[PDB]
Write a protein that binds this DNA or RNA. Structure first.
Ligand code: ZN
Ligand code: ZN
Ligand code: ZN
Ligand code: ZN
Ligand code: ZN
Ligand code: ZN
Lengths: 63, 63, 62
DNA sequence: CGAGATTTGATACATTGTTGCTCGA
DNA sequence: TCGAGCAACAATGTATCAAATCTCG
């Protein structure tokens, strides 16, 4: 068995957790930028640049 | 129920209809701004915003 | 059984309404709401695009 | 009318982003 | 140990197909 079932970060950060399925637009803390939320947002830009790099190198191997 | 195979759009405007896989970054016309490709650039934001609206409608269905 | 539209412009306001010739009967015939505005823009892009192709093909002939 | 060309809603294919969670410094 | 960094869910984008309407002899 391999279940994951993700939960939203910003909702969990200010109080009650809630899993994301359609939640990306409905979030009540979609912006905010409180100093706690503000830090996790930088992590997302970092991870995105990181994962994008690995996917480029993954393409490089076939050539 | 029908076969599919992508080919790059921007490449077709100039001749070399190269099939699309990882080609989006290796493109010899990765940007370019001729009126042929200028329209295609407009075409992509319109279709993307349009399909995104339909993806929202699926959330309205809540199913 | 086959699956088929189901008009887009009607769905935007929720009333669904399948298309069979519904073009003119659409109840939102000629509309400029931000939702229905995109499809009108889509053909204007296509029309300007096809017009460009037919013109350049014509210019070389001289 | 029908045959071929042009719309137009629809979907398969590919890219990019987000969070759970491991593993080795 | 316990974080940095990887990969599984999930969004966003890209191009083509097929129903359908249109153009026209
Ligand atoms: Zn949330
Ligand atoms: Zn916050
Ligand atoms: Zn290309
Ligand atoms: Zn170009
Ligand atoms: Zn309608
Ligand atoms: Zn409308």
């Amino acid at each position: 068995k391999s279940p994951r079932l993700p939960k939203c970060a910003r909702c969990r950060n200010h109080g009650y957790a809630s899993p994301l399925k359609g939640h990306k637009r409905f979030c009540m803390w979609r912006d905010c930028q409180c100093k706690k939320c503000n830090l996790i947002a930088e992590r997302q830009r970092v991870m995105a640049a990181q994962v994008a790099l690995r996917r480029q190198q993954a393409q490089e191997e076939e050539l």
